């Protein structure tokens, strides 16, 4: 009876899954449904040459398709999926991923680390109560985020690889007495080395709050619990929002360094993660005390939560500035059971592509940009092959189905001939249309338009945040752009 959305992501110990329900009111606000995570492992799964091998990618597939039949489960539909440090480094990474959609329908589709702090610490600021000033470590299986912002977003972030099982594979463990106290130490020394140069920007200073997220900070503050005398985090509900000592930190990871690792395992708190648990405290204490915290709180808030604020963010921003005819194209693209994060980004950026070609001299009629708007919004509707006349919808729906052979033959009954002057106006704008939404093939909502500009006979496409696939698929659909409007290069 209200929209249900799910966005998953793919990190680099396990893969996280959100599935939840917009909140009434378009306010941004969500009422989570399920939540579901997948030991993908894929840190593990990693080759000398650092590529994934294809056990990761029947580890990656396995884990999409769990989440690909949960979203139908809640009537979501599709789910966006975001990919960090472990496919973000792999040199097949873009190769895995487009192989995972082929057996899936799912892309796992990479992020800059900088990208996930911003989304991270969003998530954070779900679940925690954030002050004026805030530094948030996030230290997951493959990298560790820093990140430094106020009471609603992120300001500074850093992104390092100190990543827990990165660490544990880079600081082997010896036989000695004394071979966990060394590679803590050696962890230690590794943190403060890359760490160094940048450590101001997110140094405590007087009324700093420290926060921590994902599973091994998680898991800590679950252990210090059950020893300060209280009882494991499955009961108490969950570990959101627990706060420790920097002096409790530094007496867990000692009893660890004791312990050799089958007893790890045995750890109240532990159980689930011993394999890489020593690093990743390691990583921890030397970070905190880095930038001299004493004290910390535990999100259970991490990406997905982030990613989940971002897109009702980005929906019902561009809700807004719709007309009433708009809008109302918008709810009908609903009822059809259209995805209008997508619908809405291929419309922003189709009327970034026909602004910039109208500033470039480009003629258009009046109507165009009214007919592109719905189009875009309407280009995945299956029904059809509110506001707008019916030459103007002839328009538009010829402008959503556009093929260079007409679905009626031309001499079969009901072909439906515009005059020429629509003839040529549906081309162009059609054109537009396949552009567009080949950048936002891979439904991140991120791609924009940087610059378009003129290059001989054709056109030379400056484009951000856009994936393999984006860039592949603006490549394939572009033929069209080329008959009405020449050659077009897009780079970057
Ligand atoms: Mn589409």
Known sequence: SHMRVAVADVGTNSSHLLIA????????????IDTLKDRTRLGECLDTRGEL?????????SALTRFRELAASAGAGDVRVYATSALREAPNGAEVAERVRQRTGLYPAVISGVREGELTYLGVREAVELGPDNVLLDLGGGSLEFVRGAEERAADVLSLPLGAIRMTR?????DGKNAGRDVADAVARQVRELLRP????FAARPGTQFFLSSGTAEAAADAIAQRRGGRPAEAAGGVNGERFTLTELAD????????????????PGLERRGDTILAALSVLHAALDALGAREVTVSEGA??????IEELAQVQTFSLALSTRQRSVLATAGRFGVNLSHAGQVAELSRELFDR???????FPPPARSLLTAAAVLHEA???????????????AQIARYHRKSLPKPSHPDYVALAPADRALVARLAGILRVADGLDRAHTGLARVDDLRRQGQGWQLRVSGVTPLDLAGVGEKGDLWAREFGPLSVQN
């Open 21 to 32: 329900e917009a909140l009434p009111g378009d306010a941004g606000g969500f009422r989570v």
């Open 53 to 61: 091998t294809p056990e990761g990618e029947e580890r990656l597939a």
């Open 382 to 396: 299956g029904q059809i092959v509110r506001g707008f006349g019916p030459q103007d919808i002839e328009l538009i």
């Open 170 to 174: 880079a600081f082997p463990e010896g």
């Open 252 to 267: 867990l990871l000692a009893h660890v360094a004791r312990l050799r690792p089958a007893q790890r395992a045995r750890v």
């Open 357 to 363: 070609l109208l500033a470039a001299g480009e003629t």
């Open 303 to 308: 990406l997905r939560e982030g990613m989940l």
């Open 198 to 201: 940048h450590a101001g920007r």
